[PDB]
Amino acid sequence: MKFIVASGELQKALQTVSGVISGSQSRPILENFLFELENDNLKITASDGETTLITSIPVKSENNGRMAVPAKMFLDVIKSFGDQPLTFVEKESENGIGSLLEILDEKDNYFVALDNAEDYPELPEFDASKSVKIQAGILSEALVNTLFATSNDSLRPVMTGVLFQFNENEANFVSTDSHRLVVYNRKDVMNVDNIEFIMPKKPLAIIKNILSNTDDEVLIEFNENMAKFSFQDNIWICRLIDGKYPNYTAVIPKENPNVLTINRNLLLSSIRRASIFSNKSTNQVRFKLSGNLLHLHAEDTEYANKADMQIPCEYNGEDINIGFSSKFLTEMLSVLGSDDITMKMSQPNRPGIIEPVDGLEENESILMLSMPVIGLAGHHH
């Protein structure tokens, strides 16, 4: 097969599908891009066996073909060029058992050895039974809010992923670990098909880098156990996590009369400083709230360091003494971008509910629950 394509267009297409190639040589055929050339359309596929990324670009050609091109090398090769048309010709090695990909650029020649394309598996016929639509910019903000930066909990399978709930009234995006619950809600995302599914983290991270922040629609189609995203000339296919996500709404305390209103960056930077003085193993801080004063306390009995900070705030509520793991709390505060947050509390053994004060669009809301540190004897019952 032979085709001519602008190197910039080729690089962008290759870069889009490359995030799923892990460098693993356990299935060596999956270290390749799969090129499929048909009627001036170059379809490029990469996969790790569970996530598959596909894109296509127009090219100039007169013939068809299929090629398995080693991905890391070939992308490095394309990256080494400026913007110029490149010619690609598959040649059978004059001495060998397989075939070469030759690149022609003026008087210069390059050869990249190819794998056996017949060994690159075909994807199965996707038989969509349901589909939803969501704008790319909305989906990417959902991923900004639900994908945690740290995740060192060994959770059960349904909670290791992100829940997507779509119905005719709204969409919900939910994630959790032992310290946090994020519920992100869009009442402006409405679909006839009611569907619920759990997306694993790795394809979500891969998709997050590919998604643009635009009003362009993403189609998501579903079969037995896969989701198929379609966005411009891209297709992303992911294995879903089987099972039923817990009834997360039942965990949200109904009454939270103790409302802290505070500048977000002040609370975030204060906790970060205080936790430097706590025990390196647990990184906990205590909140003592009373009047319009937040008293932060951290100490490390092993090393004799201590922090005591008084932070002015708006607090209408009863005196409360409540402890938190600072790393998980500050990560959530870093995800919000508002000037002010509220943290609504009830008892020291119940989660605090963090919400932005400002900065939400009309039909957008987010709820961030932070589970406090509580001795087991004082658990809710």
Next chain:
Amino acid sequence: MKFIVASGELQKALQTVSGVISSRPILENFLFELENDNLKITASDGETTLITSIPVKSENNGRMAVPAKMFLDVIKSFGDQPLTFVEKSLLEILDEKDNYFVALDNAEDYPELPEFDASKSVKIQAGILSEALVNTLFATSNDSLRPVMTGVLFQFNENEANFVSTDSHRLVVYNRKDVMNVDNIEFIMPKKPLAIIKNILSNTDDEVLIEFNENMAKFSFQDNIWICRLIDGKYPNYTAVIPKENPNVLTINRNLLLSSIRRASIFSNKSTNQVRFKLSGNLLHLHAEDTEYANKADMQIPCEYNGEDINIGFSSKFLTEMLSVLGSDDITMKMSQPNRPGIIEPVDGLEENESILMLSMPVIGLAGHHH
């Protein structure tokens, strides 16, 4: 004052009370009070006061403030020898033809304790109290708990004594139906004096008297006195967090479970140190993994399990620490759902009126918390 005492006896007395000396400078001293051949030795950090006394040979009485680290270092540097001490303000030590001097503080500056006016009292055998502390004093606890949960709850009434401790991962309830006192009392002991008391208490039938006033406990045991400031507040209602129905019973060799978790946890993330249990049939599957570094462990442990399949996760350090305190060959762990505590109890070795209950809180995503 002047007295003669064998260095070994003096050393044991000093070591008994030295554990509380860490504070303001007068509290860095031992307080010596000599009265009719009885040398009372007092040490304090301002909240806990430890007292012991030993017989000595003397002809007069007195009071001295002796700097503790220095003096115990000195006594330790001797072999077993009768030593003469003369207060002169210096303390002179005489050993045959050898002379030593230690500078002294002003004893008049050492705070006296107020006269203790007991309103209630309980008694408990030292061995019973000592076992209670073995079961409730955690080897490590790094949680910043609220003040009432940083201590150990003592409950005495006419029917039983209860000893309860907790952190974010554990609840220990130690019950003795053979410890009965007329006085009903409930109080929270801070951990630090409890640790010192655990090392001094013997495993004997000698009785420990505990007396109380407004907010102090005074323990008496042989020639020791321990006076501790109690933690103010009410301990939480711990019985309400113990699940009532636990149809899923694991019976398993404790040492095998303990060593298996220890190995598997080497393969977990160093930050959280968690293992997942997959129970089905008579087989426990242990799984640990470190997603950051691609390490993994999968182990199969034979057991007796009659119950439904369960997939439940635990923090290994806190689980293994409680299992290490128990001494029976087998334990039962009773579970219900993956978001509820598992109840660990020994199979053998409890006396007639002794029971131990250990709750392990599992690792559970907040979305699936109990409700």
Next chain:
Amino acid sequence: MKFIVASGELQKALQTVSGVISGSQSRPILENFLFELENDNLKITASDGETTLITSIPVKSENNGRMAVPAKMFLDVIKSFGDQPLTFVEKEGSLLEILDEKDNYFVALDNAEDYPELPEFDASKSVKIQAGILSEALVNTLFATSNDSLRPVMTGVLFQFNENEANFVSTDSHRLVVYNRKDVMNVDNIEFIMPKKPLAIIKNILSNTDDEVLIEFNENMAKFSFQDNIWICRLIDGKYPNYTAVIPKENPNVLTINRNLLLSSIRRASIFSNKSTNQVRFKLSGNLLHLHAEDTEYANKADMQIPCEYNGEDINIGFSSKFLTEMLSVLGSDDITMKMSQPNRPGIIEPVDGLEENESILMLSMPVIGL
């Protein structure tokens, strides 16, 4: 001691000297910053036992003192602030208190008396050099130093000063850089070998200014002084290799070529190169450079034709692409010459443009040799 200073000023000073605290110091006292306060001047010292970094900043205070502050933690603490005045109070198990309005922080301190003092430096010789010239010397030489602790002299940079010029040489036996400045003239003639690690640290602290750096010498130490910084380093003992014997007197085969063009061409060609030697072949004839790379293990190949100016006989010579690209990326000229003799002799790269009047650079690459 007690002093007040803006957090931003303290952070920059700490950051200046922190690069020599490498973490796991075999002596734990060397994990501290040493603070010495004298007449409103806070002198801050860090050391790994061989290199000592010193800076000082003005502060507001009423007394003097000495403190050893744990470095990693204290820098973390200062970094966690914005630009605000901070109050520091030494409380001598010695503590450091930090006061900010109504907020209080305590950092446990080590014993400053345990921090080693530096010996009185007894300078016998000294040279001066502009900071910008010295840093340019380091930019050109540090990448070529060896990383084997086998030949210590090659892990450093040779410094040569006399009344006519300053010369800087580095090598790892595969590359040689000679950097020469005839506008750096000092009465004292001195020759010495500086270790790479303090040189890298110094390179980041040095600014690109005409302000002078003083270097003073005693038996086997160099003391650099530059503004309010002092850097004291142990010199490498021994004789630097006879590097001029590696430069052939004649290199008649001269390639003249655009630097970025040669650099980007080698970069592309190297993707196809031998994973073991990462070799690119230059085939020169007429006014055409042919670049060839191939990977015998994986069946990839590159053949590139670059028009150039070449005066010499036909030559086919191989070089390590990693070393060649590193060297071409350090130079900044539009054009370079590469002078060669035989296929088993070095290629010598020099910039054509962009050098100051009394500045010259020589970058030698050993060829690839194989059967």
Next chain:
Amino acid sequence: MKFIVASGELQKALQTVSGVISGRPILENFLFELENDNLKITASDGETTLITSIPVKSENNGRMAVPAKMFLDVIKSFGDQPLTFVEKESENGIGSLLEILDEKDNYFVALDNAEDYPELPEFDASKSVKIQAGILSEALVNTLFATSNDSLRPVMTGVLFQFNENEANFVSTDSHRLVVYNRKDVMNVDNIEFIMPKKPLAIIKNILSNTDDEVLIEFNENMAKFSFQDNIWICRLIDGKYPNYTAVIPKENPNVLTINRNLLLSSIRRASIFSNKSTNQVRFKLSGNLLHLHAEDTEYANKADMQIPCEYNGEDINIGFSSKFLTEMLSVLGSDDITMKMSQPNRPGIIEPVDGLEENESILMLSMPVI
């Protein structure tokens, strides 16, 4: 690669070389090289390289970089059982995994890139000496405590090795203590003198057995290569001139104290508690057959005065020594009695064991006096 080995042998092999891995990231790995049922294990900190080898069962060859702390922790968690190790490609990343199979249990340890682990350097031996393992080990037992722990004056941080055709000398000093260990039964044609650094010697002391098995030491410019059974140790030698240690040792020392070692040691330990906190000095006042020990701390008002009967033939002398250095030196000796030979109150005292030395073995431990 795939191999089977007893867990106990693997643990012993790993612990032998693991002492050199401190906290470059590639050097935190063991390097495994498997060839014809021989598993060679390498560890290094970049300056010291330790190598051991053990027989294993295998059918293929290979190379692995195994993370050391984790892997040794893993091996330690097993008892004595055969373990199977299989290198597999990672399923989700670019690296490679080491699988450990124990019956139905599977464990995976992520591996580093072995191609990034440095090869051993070509050793070009020019000279060699031989010495029994036990003799060398005893030499290090006597000398390592005396080395300086200040990195100022590097050569004093090592132990001098002197071999010639007549004897071997091992010398250490920190300018306050000097130890000379002499063996007139260690003879080699090659006369060699070199300085070994302290850290590898401490490791080497523990690997060496107390047997007549020969240690071969080969040398080049600044590397020593020790070979002892299936171990290889490669260390960078310390360059520079060791002090002329023979000039501080007085030849004539007419004032000789002979005394039980434990009696002098325990007596100095006691006195040193009462001594000057800055110098920790004790005075010897020797006359007749009486040793008067005196210590005092004028700042804190403590004093010690001891009379010890002894054998002293000499003139009345009043001489002070550091009790900390004296007690350490007496604790390293193991004889029943020691002699301390003195001359003037401002000249060193020389301590030697009285009994227990072999015919051609001598020990000299010199203490610089306080003045």
